[model samples]
Target chain A: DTSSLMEQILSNDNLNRAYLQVVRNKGAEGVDGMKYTELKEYLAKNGEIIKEQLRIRKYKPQPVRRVEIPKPDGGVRNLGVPTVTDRFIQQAIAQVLTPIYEEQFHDHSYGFRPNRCAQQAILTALDMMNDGNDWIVDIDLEKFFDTVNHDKLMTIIGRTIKDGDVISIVRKYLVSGIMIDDEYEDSIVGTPQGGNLSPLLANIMLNELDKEMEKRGLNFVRYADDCIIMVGSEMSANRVMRNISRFIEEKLGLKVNMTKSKVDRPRGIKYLGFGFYYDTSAQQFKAKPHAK
Target chain B: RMDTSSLMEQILSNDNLNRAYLQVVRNKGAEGVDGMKYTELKEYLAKNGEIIKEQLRIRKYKPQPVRRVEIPKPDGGVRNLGVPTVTDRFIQQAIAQVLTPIYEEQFHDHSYGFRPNRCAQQAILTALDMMNDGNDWIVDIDLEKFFDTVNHDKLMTIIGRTIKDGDVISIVRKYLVSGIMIDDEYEDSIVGTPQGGNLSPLLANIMLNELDKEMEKRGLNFVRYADDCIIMVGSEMSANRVMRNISRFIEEKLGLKVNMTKSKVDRPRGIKYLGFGFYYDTSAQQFKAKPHAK
Candidate 1:
């Protein structure tokens, strides 16, 4: 089902040169201990083999190298470092799927989508709130990437993508093993947190929730795992909060962090690190920067 | 003095017009000149698509007189709003729709004027963000009679490079030369696109695109909203240099006049753009917006 234009791009020497330049600028070694020069050589020689593997549904991703980075909250966040070759393949797949998946996403969804950002999401929510909806239900998903059921996500993917080769390749990436402190484990449930495809996969999985919300005529905005429901009254907001909480656990098999999820007046509710509140003096909805 | 070859090619290209051009025109309401609405024009075009196409191919369009209406400006001044015929407006919308995406791709990131999904608030936000680094020298530029002073032949010449269709070029040429009827008298216009027409801003933007490219090539940081331009520089010397260079480029290169009284180098804390005042708050370490008095 791939177009000849995509095929031409894949085999283009200019693209290879650009990829080599990126690897050089990145200045990092892959899991295979190959940096700029070595990776360039490998790609120059075995690039066609890799393309053939991708075409024939025989492509396999290498185990991700896990590292910990300090967060502002005095916690260490796990960052999965992919091999250079794996990154190359991930980018290629991303380029092919971007336009297709972009059209599938809801307008209210802004996380990781091109030309849409946190600002747009915040502005949209503020606009709705200004239209007299004073209450908001802010939701936070616990371990979002780690808890995504791989089979359910693939089922969602299958609805839009029918090609078996593409499906097999995506499935391989989802179940790709991770290496941590010399321990190897295959992923059976959630996708890798820092994988290149993780955001798209998470958005796809949450698309089901979006559709359910739309069917029930609920007003909400979702930025990947972050979801905020705006309503005219506290009663409606509370009801939505409970229903969404239940839906996440029952339908998606994910846990809602109760501490971080609540329905209240939008006076100080923060979404995407920005707070929305009605300025009584100004009589208008205003956005303020909040401490995350 | 801009090369419009690629832009003309984009307008003449059948594919660009079929999708992007038609999409924009369809959304436009049925406002037309001489009492002919868009609905009438749509029906007319639908039944005589081939006939209109042939007429356009032969550069034959019935001269539709321009209708002038006076609008009161906020400063107690009067502005003329010229209404083009429904057919002319439709063609203008098509050309605008085709050029918007092309120009949007080439416009600088700092330019927020007349762009899709962008506004003056974002432009001010960008300026404020850049000012946070202590790069506070700002030059606000105002153009005099911006819409009325556009050079027609220069614009057409710029467009000619991209558009090779003789018919398309000839049609546009005729439209440019077509005089407007004012107070029951016909007067041939020697200059700019009609200020109130849909295609005016797009054509002006194309002219400004040249200045944007020149500024980018010189590594100057600036934001533009139609005729209004704001440049940010790290120091007073660089600000002066940028102001001088841009003024010369606008007048000498683009053949547009600059209003010196309204243009100046100032601090970011007091600059106004698009009816909003952008000022940096030291305590907050971020930009805040307030209503602009002027």
Candidate 2:
């Protein structure tokens, strides 16, 4: 049934747009050792040949270049950069599948989505805080990018995007081993950071959490792997916390970062670096973002 | 100069594309290294035809390295052939037909090779006529590796002389260097072209036409069929001078080599060329031409 989706992916219009994104990506090379300048040269000559190879299922992605880079806070993030060829393929898929998957997300889902941002997600969070619900449970997914089970993620993907080639290509990207310091490691789990397509896969992975919270009448605002559920009392907080926590760990094979994930009044906490409080002069409990 | 407009349009019309497709089908063309048979081309084009057409129109379609194969020549020698893909063959047809008329107008009469309404027999008759008319010396020229030694830029220089369209010239340049893939490894051809391709004979003639023109410039009577060139002259002295000049002109000007072992001067009745020998007819009082004798 995704025949049309494959057409959309391989369309000239889509590839043109996809190629533009690849240039914008200006991303570092992978194990292919081809720079953007050289990649363009290579693609120009073999564009037809690659298309033919892909059409006949004679194509496969190379191993990803894995690297560790320092994060904003402390630890380094594991980055998996795909080859420009593979990255271009990822963009082609993301271009076609983005529209279809957008509709599958929750209405308030704000992380890594098209035309939506964390700034807008801050509005939803602050507004939910002042809605007379005293307790806000700040949800944190531990190593969400690192611990995503491949089988579990693909199941979420298979539910909507059902095509043999699409399914096969995505799995190829997942199973394509990662390389760090010239050392290769077989990857059976985790959608590592730095792939253009990884964020979409990340969003889809934790989308089920949004559904679980929505079912129990918990009003929450989610920014990708993080979400804040508002409740009336502490009893309501622990009860729903344990329930969703158990669901995430057992059902979805994800761990909750208990130390960082907390249940408290909204005043002392910050959502993505902007804190919310009851301002006395303003005469209202409202949003206040941290300064530059 | 040819009109800038309608040059490629005349070549790229639907009628031309269909004719190219039909011509390739007529040959029952074999598959290239890609292993894509002409039989499967219908389905392949059904999906990629428009995409490919746009590439051709925008001057973006590039010919890839050809698939290489070796076949037995005579006794122990082997001949090399490069097979282009079925799709490329069809497109080559498209380009060749469109450019043939223009290229044909530039060629001279005594050069009869790979042109429409011309044959080695025509060249043979011309050679015999020169012998009968008292040019008793025959300088049989050996153009060694004629197809494989054609320089890329020199060939482009020849095409750009009359054809002004950049796209047409660009198309030919891309086809010139399609490298050969030997045993799954590819090596780009900076010189020469494939042996079995649709446009090989045409490009060969275009390169060697310079030789024909130079022969005419030096005021020698020569008949050339592709690379088998024979210049007729009055005496051993004329034959020797003409052979030396032609050999230098071929190597220095045309970027082709002359095989000194096979190239020699022969008498009028002793001339052997195009797999034939010439003789003085006793009763007929004229020169006679026939196939070689053991």
Q: Of the candidates shown, which would achieve the greatest lDDT relative to the real structure?
A: 2
Q: What TM-score describes the B chain of model 2?
A: 0.85
DockQ, every prediction: 0.03, 0.00
**Each model's total of backbone clashes:** 7, 0
Clashing pairs in 2: none
* lDDT of candidate 1 over B1-294, digit per residue (tens): 223443444553467445533543433332435676544765766676456555665656564655565643332345455556666666666566665665676677777655566544456556655665457898877787554666777767766555555655676656555432111000110111223245666566667778888988998777776667888889989888888989999988888888888888888666766555655433123455543442
lDDT of each: 0.61, 0.67
Candidate 2: tens digits of C-alpha lDDT, residues B9-41: 767788988898876764553467788866688
Q: How would the docking of model 2 be graded? A: incorrect
Model 2 chain A scores worst on lDDT over the 10 consecutive residues at A181-190
Give the distance in Å from residue A63's predicted Cα in candidate 2 to where it truly belongs.
2.9
For candidate 1, the per-residue lDDT at B55 reads: 66
TM-score of each candidate's B chain against the true B chain: 0.76, 0.85
Q: What digit string (tens of lDDT, one per residue) describes model 2 on residues A98-132?
A: 78878878877876566554445655555455456
RMSD of each: 13.0, 31.0
True contacts kept of 1: 0.00
True contacts kept of 2: 0.00
Give me the candidate number with maximum TM-score. 1
Off by over 4 Å in 2: A177-195, A285-292, B1-294
